[PDB]
Design a protein around this ligand. Structure first.
Ligand SMILES: O=C(Cc1ccccc1)Nc1nnc(N[C@@H]2CCN(c3nnc(NC(=O)Cc4ccccc4)s3)C2)s1
Ligand SMILES: O=C(Cc1ccccc1)Nc1nnc(N[C@@H]2CCN(c3nnc(NC(=O)Cc4ccccc4)s3)C2)s1
Lengths: 410, 410, 410, 410
C-alpha cells in the first residue's frame, strides 16, 4: 500500500478518477503554491499529461501515481494536515482581518530624507506570510518592490556569523540593546558598537563579510545568499536609492570615522569602501512576498522552507533572532519585545521583517513611519497578531486563555 | 477493555498480579514523585490496601483498578510516555552530568554584606527540576532552606499583574532593561523605575500589592500566593536575614526616599512600611525543590504542575517571563539572554530561578557569586544546559544541529 | 555439580576426603591468610568442626561444603588462580630476593632529630605486601611498631578529600610540586601550600578534618578511618614520639604562624591546637603489615582488600595517588617518579608506603635515611622492584622487554 | 579445525557463502581500516577475487580461506572481540560527543607569532584515535596538516634515548619539571636544562641526535623515524613555518648561547647549526590522523600499532611518557597531571599529542591557545575524556564509580 495510492483515495473521495482541478484546488487549500520549487516535478508532469491526454482531464490511480510520485512526501504531509498550520485557510482569513484593521490606521510620515522614499505612496500596505512548511499567503501590495534598508541588518549579521562564527563576530560588535538613551553613542564601554542592529554595529558587521575581495564580489556574495534565503524569489537593487543614500549619509560617515579612529574594524579595512558597501546593502530590494520567505528561513532554523535548502547555520539564526528580539525595532525595541514578543526588524522604507520561530516568517510593508521610525500599520498589525494568536515568545502552548492557536484544530 | 485494565496489563506483563513495589518503581521512573498531590487518592487507597493485606501485598486487576481509577488519566499519561519529557530517566542523568561539571567550578564569593549569608557554605550546590507535567528531579543540596532575595522579584511582580493587570502595574514601573551601561539610575525618563527586576522597581511593585490592608496581612497574602505557586511545598521566612537586611538597607532607603519625592508610589503609600515589607519578601525562604515548582508554574502558563491549580493569569506569567529574559541577571542580563536564552532570576543568596517555557522550571543554588552577583555554578550550569539541549528560546525545534531534544524519544 | 563440590574435587585430588591441614596449606599457598576477615565464617566453621571431635579431622564433600559455602566465591577465586597475582608463591620468593639485596645496603643515618627515633636501630628492615585481593607476604621486621610520620600525609589528605571533596580541600592547599629549589617556601604564588605532601600542606590539611569538634574527637575519628584502611590491623600511637615532636617543633610553629598570618586556615581555626593535632598524627603507629593494607586500599580504589569495605571515595584515592607520584619523596620525588614510577610516601621513621595501582600495597621500613630523608634500604628495594617487574606507571603491559609480569602465569 | 573456518561460520551467520561487502562491513566495525598495512595480503586477494570473478561476489569457505589466511591471527582477534576496546563503535560514538562538546568552546587566541600560522582559522578542530590494536577513528578536521612544533619534543627525545640510552641523554638534560613553574630559567642547579619538554631541554636533546652528519642527514634520519611511528602515514615539512621560526627565534638564540657558554652541548657541537636543525624539527608536519598513530606507538610500548613494527625501545617510550606526564603541558603541567592523569604534549599550532598507556594514542588539534599556550578545545576534550572514562593514571581498573570503562563490555 504505497503512499501514492493511499493518498489517491483521500482526494478520490471514493471515485475511480480525480479531477485535475480538484487536485490542484485541494493542493492550494493547504497553502502550498503550485509554483513551489519542491513541487516542480509533479507540476511538470501534470502539465505534460494535459498535453498528451486532452482526452480528459482526470487522473487514474496509476496516472496520479506518475505525477505525484517524485514529490510524494511533501504532498502527503500537506494532505494529512501535518503542516505547522493545519487549517491554513482559516488562518489566512484571520490574517486578512488583521490586515483590514491596520489598513484603517492612516497616520505616520513617509521617510523623505532621500527622494527615493518620498516617492512611495502612504497608502501602500502589504503583508506576506510564509510558514516553515512553505505555506503562503499575501494580502495587499505584496509585489511592490521596496528597499530593505535596516531590515538587511539581521540578514548580513546572520551571514557573518554563519561564515565566521559568533565568537569572532562579537570581538567587533556587542550583543545587547544600548538601552534607549545611549541612542547616540556609537560604542559601548568596550569600544564596540552595542549590537549589530544599530548603524554603527551594522557598519562593523558589513566590514567583516568576505574580507579581501572587492565590493563587487562582496555584493554578489551577499546577493547569492539573499537569493537562497528567499528561495530565489525577488531580490533586487535600487541604484537610485544607493546614490541618494551615499550622497546624504553624513552621520554614517561620522560613524565611519569614529569607528576607524577607535580601531573598531579588522586590520586592512578600507573604511570608506565599507561605507559604500553598506549603502549598497541598504538599497537591496524585495517584495513582501520574497522577504516573507527570507523571514521564514530564519523561522525554520536556517532552512529555506520552499526549497528545503540549508541557508544559514542554527547558530547564525539563533543569534540573529536573539538580537531582533531585543534590538530590532529601534527605540521601540523594549516595548515591542514586551508586548509582541517576536524577533523583528524594521526599516525606513516601511518594512518590518518578522519571525515567528517554528511557525512562520512575515514581511509587513507600509511606508508611513511613527516618531520612532517604525511602520505605523506594521506595528499595529504586529500587536493585533499576538493579541489574536499565542505567538508571543512567552505565551504558553498549553495554557493561553482566549488566544487562538493556529498550530491546532478541534 | 478500559483505561485501568489497559494500564494494568502494561505494568503487569503477562503475569497475573502486580507487586506494589513494582508499580511504585514503575511510577517513579516516569519522574512523578509518589507524594504528588494529584496522586493522593491513589496513594491513600494504596495505604488502605497495604493495611488490608499484610497478607499480600500483590494487586490483582480489580484491586489495582480500585487504587488507580481516581487518578487514571494522570497515571496513563505518565505510563504511556505522554509527559513533556518522555524519557525523563535519561534526562536526569544529563542533569546529573551538568551538575557535576558545575560542581568543579569552585570560584566566586559568598555575599557577606549581612552575616546570615556569610555563614552559608561555599560548597553547597543543588539543582532541582520540575517539568510542566510534575516530573521531578534533584541533585545536591536541594532541601536546604535559603532566602529568595531577588528571586522573589518576578514572583511578586507576577502577583501584582495578576491582581491588578499589566496596564495599571506599568503606570508605576517600566518594562525594559536599563541594559548594562548606566546601571545606577533609579528612574527612567518617565520617572518610573526601569523595570520590576531592579530594586527600585521591586520596591514600587511591592507598594501595589494588596493596598489598604496592613503589612501583616500583605505578607500573609503573598505567603499564601507563594504556597499555591510551590504546590504547598516548603516556603518559609528568615527573620535573621530580615533583621540584617533592614539595618543595612541604606541604599534601599535612598531609593525609597527618592521614589517618594518623585511621587512614584500609589497615593496613600507609607514608604517606610513598604521598605519593611520588601525586606520581608527578600527574606522569604525556599529550597531548590520547592522553588523549582514555582518556576514550573511560570513554565506552565500559571498552572501549578503538581496540583493542577491555576495560580497566575497567563498575562502575569508572560509579562514576568518577558522581563526575566531581559532584566533578570543584573549586568549579565544581556549576555545571559544572548547565550542561554532562558528567562531567569538570580538573588544574592546564590539562587537562580530558571524557566524553560512549556518544558520545566528549575532552581539552582550555590552561594558563591561572581562579580556581577550571580551564582557561579548556577551560571555555568545554565550555559551548559543550553549547550546540551535545544532549550534556547531562539533554538529551532526542528533543526537544531547536534543538540539534544529531551521532548522527543530521539 | 555445585561450586563447593567443584572446589572439593579440586582440593581432594580424586581422593574421597580432604584433611583439614591439607586444605589450610592449599589456602595459604594462594597468598590468603587464614585470619582473613572475609574468611571468618569459613574459619569459624572449621573451628566448630574441629571441636566435634578430639581428633578427626577429615572433611568429606558435605562437611567441606558446610565450612566453605559462606565464602565460596572468594575461595574459588583463590583456588582457580583468579587473584591479581596468580602464582603468588613465586612472587613472594622474588620479594625475598629483593629484600635480601636491600638488606645489604647498610649506609645512611637514623633520624637523631627527635629523642624517640635515635634509639631505633639501623638493623631493622621489613617489607610487607598486600595485594588488591588480600594476598599477603612479609619478610623481616614486619610486626615492629613505628610511627608513620610523614607517611600519614596521603592518608589524612585522602580522608579530607573523602569527607569534604576535592574543590574545598584545594581551596586551602595546592596540587603541584614546587621547585626542588622552592622546597623551602611554605606557600605558592596563590598563597596556598604547594601540595598535601609538604609540612605546610599537611598542616593545612590537618586543619580541614572534622572541624567543630575537639582534637581528641578528631584524633579518634582519624584512628577509626585508619582502622578501616588497615582492615583493623595494627594502628597505634607513640606518646614518646609525640612529646619529642611537640618540643622540637620550631619549624612547624614557624609554618603555623606563617599560615595564620597569610590566612591559610579555615575560619575559626585554632592554629596552635592544629599543630598539636598535627604532631599526634605524625606519631601514629603502624607495623609493616598493617600499613601495607592501608597502601592496598589505595591500590584498590578505596576498598580495603582484606575486608571488602568501601573506605575511601575514588576521588580521594586518585587525588592521593596523583600527589604521591609527584610530591611523595621530598627532593627525590622527581627522580623517584622518573625511575620507579610508583606513587609512594616516605617518613623520617624509615617508612615508605608504596602503592602499585590495581596490583598491591606495600610498606617498607628501615630507619636509616639517606641525605634526602628517605629510607636507604626502602629506596633501593623500590628501584629493584621496578627493575624486576613491569610495575612502573609507564611500563607497557603488553611489551615490556625482559621484565617479569607477576599478573601473568606461565 | 582451522581458524579460517571457525571464523568463517561466525560471519557466515548460517549461510553457505559470505557476501564480500558483509565481510568488509563486519571488519570495519571492529575499527580496523581496510587500508591497514597488516591487512594488505587479505585486501589484495579480495580485490583480485573481485576481478577473477564477475560473479557473486560471495566467498566460499574455501574462497574466504584463500583471502584471509595470511592475516588470519589479526582477523581472529578483531572478530572475536579481543581488541583493547571491544565495542569500538560505542566508544567512537562517545568520542564524537566529547568532540561536539569541546567544539562549542570557542575562546582562546591563535598563536600570532610572526604571522603565518595565523593563516589557518580558529574554527579548525579535529580529533583522531588510534588504539594499540590499530583501531581508528576520526572526527572533524583530521586530515589538515599542521606543524608538530613542541609536540615533536617527546618524539625526538624518544629517538635520542632509543639510540643513546637514558644514562647518556641525562648527562645533558634533567628528568624533572622545572617546578611550580619557572621556565624563566634555562638551567637547573646542575647546569642542565630541567627536562626535555622545555625549549632549552629540547634544543640540547636535538644536539644529541645523529652526531657527526650534517643537518639534512640528521633531518632525514628523524623523518624516517617519524615515518615508522606513524605507520607511514603523513609526515611532512613546512618550509614556510621554518623560515619564519628561523627569523623569529631570538629567545632560542638566547638559549643557544647560554647553553654553549655553560657547556651544555656535547663536544664538537655547532650550536648555531643545532638551532637550525631544531627549527626544522618544529616545522615538521602531521595530520591529526598520522599523529594519533605516533601517540599510539608510545601507547603500545614502542611498537607501531598499524604495522606491528618495533620503532622505539621500552626504555625510550617509558622515559618519554614519564616526562610528558609532569612536563608536557607548559604551565598547566601540574594541573593537567592532577586532573587528567595522562601523558600529553601540546604545541603552539594547537595540537595536543595524547597517550593513554596500553589503550590508545590521540592527536587533538585546534589552533586557538589559552593564556598558557595550550589549545582551548584540546584541554577541554582531555578533561571531558577522563571524566567519562577511567583512563586517568590513577583511576582504579576495578573500582571506578560512574566512569565508563571501554576496555570492557557487560
Ligand atoms: O546627546 C547630545 C545632546 C542632545 C540632547 C537632546 C537632543 C539632541 C542632542 N549630544 C551628543 N554629542 N555627541 C554624541 N555622540 C558622540 C558620538 C558618539 N559618542 C560616543 N560613543 N561612545 C562613547 N564612549 C562611551 O563610553 C559612551 C558614553 C558617552 C557619554 C556618556 C556616557 C557614556 S562616546 C560620542 S551625542
Ligand atoms: O535622570 C533620570 C531621568 C533620565 C534618565 C535617562 C536620561 C535622562 C534622564 N533619572 C535618575 N536620575 N538620578 C537617579 N539616581 C540617583 C541619583 C543619581 N544616582 C547616581 N548614580 N551614579 C552615581 N555615581 C556616578 O555616576 C559616578 C561613578 C561612575 C563609575 C563608578 C563610580 C562612580 S550617583 C543616584 S535616577
Amino acid at each position: 500500500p504505497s503512499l501514492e495510492d493511499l493518498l489517491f483515495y483521500t482526494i478520490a473521495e471514493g471515485q475511480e478518477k480525480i479531477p485535475v482541478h480538484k487536485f490542484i484546488t485541494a493542493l492550494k487549500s493547504t497553502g502550498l503554491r503550485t509554483s513551489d520549487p519542491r513541487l516542480k516535478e509533479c507540476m511538470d508532469m501534470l502539465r505534460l499529461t494535459l498535453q498528451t491526454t486532452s482526452d480528459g482531464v482526470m487522473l487514474d490511480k496509476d496516472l496520479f501515481k506518475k505525477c505525484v510520485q517524485s514529490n510524494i512526501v511533501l504532498l502527503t504531509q500537506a494532505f494529512r494536515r501535518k503542516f505547522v498550520i493545519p487549517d491554513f485557510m482559516s488562518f489566512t482569513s484571520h490574517i486578512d482581518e488583521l490586515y483590514e484593521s491596520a489598513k484603517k490606521q492612516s497616520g505616520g510620515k513617509v521617510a523623505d530624507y532621500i527622494p527615493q522614499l518620498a516617492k512611495f505612496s502612504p497608502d501602500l500596505w502589504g503583508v506576506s506570510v510564509c510558514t516553515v512548511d512553505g505555506q503562503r499567503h499575501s494580502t495587499g501590495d505584496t509585489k511592490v518592490p521596496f528597499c530593505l534598508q535596516s531590515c538587511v541588518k539581521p540578514l548580513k549579521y546572520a551571514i557573518a556569523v554563519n561564515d565566521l562564527g559568533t565568537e569572532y563576530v562579537h570581538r567587533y560588535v556587542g550583543k545587547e540593546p544600548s538601552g534607549l538613551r545611549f541612542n547616540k553613542l556609537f560604542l559601548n564601554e568596550d569600544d564596540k558598537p552595542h549590537n549589530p542592529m544599530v548603524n554603527a554595529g551594522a557598519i562593523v558587521v558589513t566590514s567583516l563579510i568576505k574580507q579581501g575581495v572587492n565590493n563587487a564580489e562582496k555584493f554578489d556574495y551577499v546577493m547569492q545568499f539573499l537569493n537562497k534565503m528567499a528561495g530565489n524569489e525577488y531580490v533586487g537593487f535600487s541604484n537610485a536609492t544607493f546614490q541618494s543614500e551615499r550622497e546624504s549619509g553624513d552621520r554614517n560617515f561620522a560613524i565611519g570615522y569614529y569607528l576607524k579612529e577607535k580601531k573598531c574594524f579588522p586590520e586592512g579595512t578600507d573604511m570608506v569602501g565599507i561605507l559604500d558597501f553598506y549603502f549598497q546593502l541598504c538599497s537591496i530590494e524585495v517584495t513582501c512576498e520574497s522577504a516573507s520567505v527570507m523571514a521564514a528561513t530564519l523561522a525554520n532554523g536556517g532552512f529555506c522552507p520552499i526549497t528545503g535548502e540549508r541557508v544559514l547555520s542554527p547558530e547564525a539564526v539563533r543569534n540573529t533572532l536573539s538580537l531582533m528580539h531585543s534590538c530590532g525595532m529601534y527605540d521601540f525595541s523594549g516595548q515591542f519585545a514586551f508586548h509582541v514578543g517576536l524577533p523583528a526588524k524594521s526599516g525606513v522604507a516601511g518594512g518590518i521583517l518578522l519571525v515567528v520561530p517554528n511557525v512562520m516568517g512575515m514581511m509587513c510593508w507600509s511606508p508611513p513611519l511613527d516618531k520612532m521610525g517604525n511602520s505605523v500599520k506594521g506595528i499595529h498589525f504586529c500587536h493585533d497578531l499576538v493579541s489574536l494568536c499565542n505567538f508571543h515568545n512567552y505565551d504558553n502552548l498549553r495554557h493561553f486563555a482566549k488566544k487562538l492557536d493556529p498550530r491546532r484544530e478541534g
